[PDB]
Amino acid sequence: HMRGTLRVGTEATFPPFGFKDENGKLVGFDIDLAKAIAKKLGVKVEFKPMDFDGIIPALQSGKIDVVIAGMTITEERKKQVDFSDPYFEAGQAIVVKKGNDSIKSLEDLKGKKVGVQLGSTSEQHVKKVAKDAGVKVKKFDNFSEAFQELKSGRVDAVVTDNAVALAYVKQNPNAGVKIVGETFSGEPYGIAVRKGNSELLEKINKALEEMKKDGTYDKIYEKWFG
Numbered sequence: 758h759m760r761g762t763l764r765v766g767t768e769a770t771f772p773p774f775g776f777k778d779e780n781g782k783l784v785g786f787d788i789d790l791a792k793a794i795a796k797k798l799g800v801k802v803e804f805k806p807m808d809f810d811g812i813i814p815a816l817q818s819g820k821i822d823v824v825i826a827g828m829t830i831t832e833e834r835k836k837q838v839d840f841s842d843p844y845f846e847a848g849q850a851i852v853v854k855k856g857n858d859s860i861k862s863l864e865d866l867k868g869k870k871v872g873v874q875l876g877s878t879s880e881q882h883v884k885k886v887a888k889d890a891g892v893k894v895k896k897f898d899n900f901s902e903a904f905q906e907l908k909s910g911r912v913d914a915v916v917t918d919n920a921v922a923l924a925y926v927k928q929n930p931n932a933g934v935k936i937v938g939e940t941f942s943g944e945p946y947g948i949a950v951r952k953g954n955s956e957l958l959e960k961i962n963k964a965l966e967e968m969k970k971d972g973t974y975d976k977i978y979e980k981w982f983g
């Protein structure tokens with residue numbers, strides 16, 4: 758059986774990788790990448806937006822064929838799913854109010870209220886420093902609602918991947934927030950397939966490799982980051 762539709766699991770509160778434009782259309786780097794992969798495979802994408810923490814189980818239970826969701830390749834997740842070669846290297850950032858001087862790194866979150874996306878690597882990084890240090894960790898499926906808790910004063914900081922932190926700041930120029938503690942790598946993004954689906958995996962890796970040789974990938978990158 759030759760699958761003509763690729764069901765792509767993603768979460769769409771993660772600009773610039775996946776979000777909704779003013780007409781409600783899914784847009785972003787990951788969206789364009791998924792379409793460019795499908796073109797190489799000779800198939801059509803169907804997006805399946807869902808809450809992030811449910812994506813791995815959706816792949817395991819056959820609700821989707823692939824994940825393209827800014828998903829960091831980790832050893833824990835490699836137990837659950839198989840990943841492509843990395844397609845992006847991200848870092849992390851903390852977003853705080855402009856008048857904040859106490860928070861410059863993860864270590865400084867002691868005693869503070871911190872918002873994170875449920876199921877994310879940021880959640881894990883925060884949980885690691887939060888051991889003992891009295892951090893109050895709050896969780897959101899919709900990251901535009903962790904961010905709104907920061908703008909409203911309901912949390913002191915939020916933590917996410919660095920390009921996404923910048924995109925939220927740029928969307929909120931009057932909202933008096935800033936990035937601190939930025940790092941630039943350490944979160945390699947991978948496309949996930951169901952564990953054991955070696956035929957699909959190989960096709961996706963070959964598509965990535967070709968996209969990086971023929972200009973296709975670089976044009977996507979420049980569109981979103983140039």
Ligand SMILES: NC(=[NH2+])NCCC[C@H](N)C(=O)O
Pocket residue numbers: 767768769770771775809826827828829830874876877878879918944
């Ligand atoms: N579309 C999304 N919301 N992606 C969140 C990804 C966050 C982080 N890179 C992770 O893998 O946990």
